[PDB]
Structures are given as C-alpha cells and as structure tokens.
Write an enzyme that holds these catalytic residues in place. Sequence first.
Site, mmCIF file in Angstrom:
data_model
loop_
_atom_site.group_PDB
_atom_site.id
_atom_site.type_symbol
_atom_site.label_atom_id
_atom_site.label_comp_id
_atom_site.label_asym_id
_atom_site.label_seq_id
_atom_site.Cartn_x
_atom_site.Cartn_y
_atom_site.Cartn_z
ATOM 1 N N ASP A 1 35.093 42.019 29.166
ATOM 2 C CA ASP A 1 36.349 42.020 28.422
ATOM 3 C C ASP A 1 36.071 42.202 26.928
ATOM 4 O OD1 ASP A 1 38.939 41.757 27.509
ATOM 5 O OD2 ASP A 1 39.236 39.724 28.279
ATOM 6 N N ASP B 1 38.933 34.543 39.618
ATOM 7 C CA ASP B 1 39.791 34.506 40.798
ATOM 8 C C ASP B 1 40.840 33.405 40.701
ATOM 9 O OD1 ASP B 1 38.373 36.625 42.225
ATOM 10 O OD2 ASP B 1 36.756 35.160 42.467
#
Lengths: 277, 302
Positions: B142, B169
Amino acid sequence: TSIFLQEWDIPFEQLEIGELIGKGRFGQVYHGRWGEVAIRLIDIERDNEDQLKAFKREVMAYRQTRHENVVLFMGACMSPPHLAIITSLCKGRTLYSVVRDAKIVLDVNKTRQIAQEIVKGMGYLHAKGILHKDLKSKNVFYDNGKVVITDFGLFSISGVLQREDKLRIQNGWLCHLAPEIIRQLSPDTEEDKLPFSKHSDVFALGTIWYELHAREWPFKTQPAEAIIWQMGTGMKPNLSQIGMGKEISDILLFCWAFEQEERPTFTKLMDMLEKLP
Amino acid sequence: DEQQRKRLEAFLTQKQKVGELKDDDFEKISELVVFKVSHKPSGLVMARKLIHLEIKPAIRNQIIRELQVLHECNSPYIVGFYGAFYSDGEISICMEHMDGGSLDQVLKKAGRIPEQILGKVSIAVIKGLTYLREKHKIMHRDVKPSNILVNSRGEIKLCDFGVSGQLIDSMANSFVGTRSYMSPERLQGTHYSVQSDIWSMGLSLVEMAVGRYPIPPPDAKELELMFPMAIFELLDYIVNEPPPKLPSAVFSLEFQDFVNKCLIKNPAERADLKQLMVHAFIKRSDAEEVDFAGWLCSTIGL
Ligand SMILES: Nc1ncnc2c1ncn2[C@@H]1O[C@H](COP(=O)(O)OP(=O)(O)NP(=O)(O)O)[C@@H](O)[C@H]1O
Ligand SMILES: Nc1ncnc2c1ncn2[C@@H]1O[C@H](COP(=O)(O)OP(=O)(O)NP(=O)(O)O)[C@@H](O)[C@H]1O
Ligand SMILES: O=C(NOC[C@H](O)CO)c1ccc(F)c(F)c1Nc1ccc(I)cc1F
Ligand SMILES: [Mg+2]
Ligand SMILES: [Mg+2]
C-alpha cells in the site's frame, strides 16, 4: 405522508420489542412479539420525500406477497423520522452461517435442493414484478430443510453507500453484482439509480451456487479494486479445482453469462437444476 | 549515517518508558481514524490509529501476535512502533507522531513538489522497501502519498504496510475512490511482488511532481495552465492504456527515465529495487545538499 399499522390484513393489537438480533448496515433488527416476529427499525432523514412515497408503494407491493420460500411480510408502520418493517421471525440460522459450519455436510443433493428452493421463491418474486436487488447467503434462512428468502427490495431505500470521493465496499457485495452493475460503480453512485434487473438477480443466485459448493465466496483472496476490474471484463472462476462435474459448472456458466440476455430465467433455471445427477 | 543510529537508539530509550498500553492512558489532542494523543504514564506524544472490527477474541489474539513484530523492525526510513492493544471493538496501533503529516496533504499545501525534494523521497522509499523485503520478507502492499510521513527533523518514513495477513482479511469493508495506486498486475489477479510497490512509488512520484493525479492524462490546455469517471473506467485505463509520463520540458532526463522505469507495465521489465539504487537519478540526488526540514517548515508553516 404516513402509513398506519391498522391498514394491514394481519390483525394487530400490540407489538413488543425485545433484544437486538444482530448488527446490520441498514437499520436495527430486534426480536418482537405479536407469536414471535422480527422488527427492523429504520430512520429517514425527512428529505427526498418523493423517494419516500415511492418507498410506500414498494411496501404496498410487499402486501400482496405470500409464498412458502419468501419471508412473510406482516406489516410496516411509518411515523417520520422513524420507519419500521415487521416480518415473520425465521427460526434456524442463515445460509451464510450454515455454509461456513464445518460440522454440517452439504452433499451435491442437498445443494441442488437448497438452490431449487431459492429459485422457486425468486421466481415468485419475479412473477409478482419484484426485484430482490440484494440476494445473498446472509439473506436466506435454512432450518432443517426449510429455505426462506429475506430482505427483498430493501436495497432501493437502503443507503448502505452513504468518505469524500470514496465509495464503501463491504467484502461480499462485489462478487454478487453482475458486470453491467460493476461497470457503473462510482464514488457518488446511489442504490436507487443502479441498473438492477431480473438478470442481475440471476447473477446473484449464480454466486450463491458457487458459494454452496466452494463453501466460500468467489474472489475470496483478492482486494476490491481487482474484483471490480476482473468482473467488469468478464473473468469468472469455475468449480473444477475442487472436482465438481460439468453439470454443476454449467450452472455458473449460464448464470454468470457476461451478456444479460444469455442468462436464463428462474423457471428455466429450475429446469436446469432438476436435471443434475 | 552515524546520526541515524543515535536517534534510533534514542528512540529505544523511550521504548521502555511504557510497558503496556490501554485506553485510559490517552487524551485526545487533535485529529489528523488516526489521532494525536497525549500519553500520561509517559510524557511521549503519540499517534494512535483505531481500526473498527467486530470479531471474536481468538482471531484478535492472532492479530496482536502478528502486530507485535513491529517492535522488532526499526529503521530510519520506516516509522517507529510503540504497541498494539484492543479495546471496545477497535484495535489500536501506536506509532511515532510526525509533525509534518503525509505527503498528500503537503502537496495539497504546496503547488507542486520540486524535483530535488522528490529525489531524496525516492531514495528513502527505495531503501525502506529494501529494508522490509531483505530483513523481514514482507512487501508494503500500500505505497501511496498518504502513507509517506515527514517531520521537522528532516526524516521521511513509510507506514501502514501490510505486516499482518489476518488483519487484511479481518477488515470488513474497504473504501474505493477515484485515485488508485494499485499496479496493473495486481488488478488482473496475477502473481505480484515488490515490483507492485515500485509501480506505486512511480505513480506517486509523478503525481507529486505535477500536482495532479495523472490518470487520465491532462490535455494540452491543462498542461499549460499548470506551468466524472466511473471506477471501472480508471482501472481499465491503468491496465490497457500506456502509463503516465512526465512532461519533457520541465524535468531532467534522469528523473523522466526514473519514473518511466518504475511505470513499466510488465513487472518483469519494471526496474527492481537494486536497479533503482544505481539509477543515475538517485546517485545524483544522494550527493546533493538540500535542507529538507527548511523546505518543509517554510512552505507548510511550522
Ligand atoms: N427474519 C429474520 N429472522 C431472524 N433474524 C433475522 C431476520 N432478518 C434479519 N435477521 C438477522 O438480523 C441481523 C441483521 O440483519 P441485516 O440488517 O439484514 O444484515 P445482514 O443481511 O445479515 N448483513 P448486511 O445486510 O450486509 O448488513 C442479522 O444477524 C440477521 O441474521
Ligand atoms: N503516523 C501518522 N503521523 C501523522 N499523520 C498521520 C499518521 N497516520 C496518518 N496520518 C494522517 O491522517 C490521515 C489518515 O490516514 P489513513 O487512516 O491511512 O487514511 P488515508 O491515508 O487518508 N487513506 P487510507 O489509508 O486508504 O484509508 C493521513 O492521510 C495523514 O494525513
Ligand atoms: O494500516 C494499514 N493499512 O492497510 C490497509 C489494507 O491493506 C487495505 O484495507 C495496515 C495493514 C495491515 C497491517 F498489518 C497493519 F499493521 C496496518 N497498519 C500499520 C502498519 C505498520 C505501521 I509502523 C503502522 C500501521 F498503522
Ligand atoms: Mg440483509
Ligand atoms: Mg494510512
């Protein structure tokens, strides 16, 4: 400007509100007493009052519904800024919770039968001219062979999308959207103006059919942006990596068809599911 | 640098001044969701980021174990980590407060960021990604201007990198907007490595250099003045259309070639971290005298 509860065919005398059933994006869902019942409390901002009266007609459309595979719409009272949708309470657990329970066997026969039940209910809603617009496992209830569909049509009035120039995606939402809808998503897109159709509901059932056999959503590994592009260009998984036959994979190929007109109706889908081994 | 070792060691003398962290230790100072907080068991002023998760204790215990490894990684090019605790449905990540903010809001403050500053930015980002891969076998996942932080001391550090696979997740919902820094190979669902982070860096550098998100490219009128698109349209533009490029007039050849090597669509042909380390652009930038703290304080106002 208001809807009363004495307008309804279910004779209504008193309504008790109990504990919260669970957290949800759209309103709160409480236990109720009438027999037990499920109460969903919603709030309206007192704006878009023409979208409000459209919500009234959609609710009056629910009034004419009664089907064994469709949750029993029992009433709806509106005293702005507060709204309430009262449906029959579902015993058992959601299909989402059943499919993710290791202690529960889901052989090919039961998955064929569960699918056929959802198809029958969705065929009824389509025949009545009602689009679900949010078919998923969290909105299907299974109690030892009893399969009921829940939360049809709420998505139009929902407001689950509401950051600046940033649209909110929850994990399982994207993989249920047909490609024509995926290509429309934008940071200022709204649920009332999304191109839903009967074909989009058939696509959502195809996602559930994958979920029944894989016991997990498609595109489980990948982030949201990759899901948007892959589904937009028409890339879809199959069920051969877990050893499922062609008969069970043809279901996905028809339901997930890229062109809308190639997707079957629910009656034709019921025919296709009857012919599985 | 000898100096960098000192401030690193001085960071670890502040490390034991707290042992454990919980909610009542902090008072909200301001909003930068991340918050500037005042710690009271210890005089450190900290940055406390809270992530909202409604989920069972067992996986959160797994989340904390995965987050504790940030106590182990320390570098002058990655922001330091204090601790991670859970309280009231939000997990907290405590890190250094960097008074300069992120590079996206300093670019919002300035008009455009000059080439010389972006050179030092490139060097630190490359060495930060190199540190994480070579020493900890993790990729950032990211990289974008909003997660590259600066301070008045003059150091720049990376943050918000993917260290916990379960935390990815466990996050219920993501926020997809009009700016995307994801590499083409990641959008198509193929195998990816730090090469995707290198693409993200290249796309971040050209945006900071020109003052606008460069996809879609601007027309002739907009390029002169500097000196309504669906999400799928942008993503498909990134995958199929040629990558953005810097204007050939205002920037040096070394910088233009640097970003061009970072934005090659094929990740096998895209430059890796080592090739960047020796590209003529950052060899030139490394041997330059630029007061980064002075540029920061004078244009932002500290
Ligand atoms: N008819 C019903 N009977 C029993 N429980 C229900 C019923 N309808 C909804 N629930 C439960 O109420 C909670 C909130 O429901 P809901 O707002 O529909 O969210 P959801 O569909 O489960 N997930 P999402 O729509 O993505 O937020 C969940 O725990 C549901 O299982
Ligand atoms: N450690 C930090 N020190 C100083 N400012 C920070 C720090 N972390 C975040 N900020 C600031 O607070 C903002 C919040 O960052 P963040 O929570 O990651 O959301 P975002 O960067 O804007 N976009 P996203 O990371 O995809 O959600 C950043 O954009 C910075 O301006
Ligand atoms: O901040 C994070 N953003 O990731 C966003 C997701 O990738 C997409 O939603 C993140 C992700 C995984 C993880 F393990 C972390 F610790 C994260 N936060 C984080 C990491 C290192 C430092 I020093 C400080 C931090 F705050
Ligand atoms: Mg629902
Ligand atoms: Mg961030």
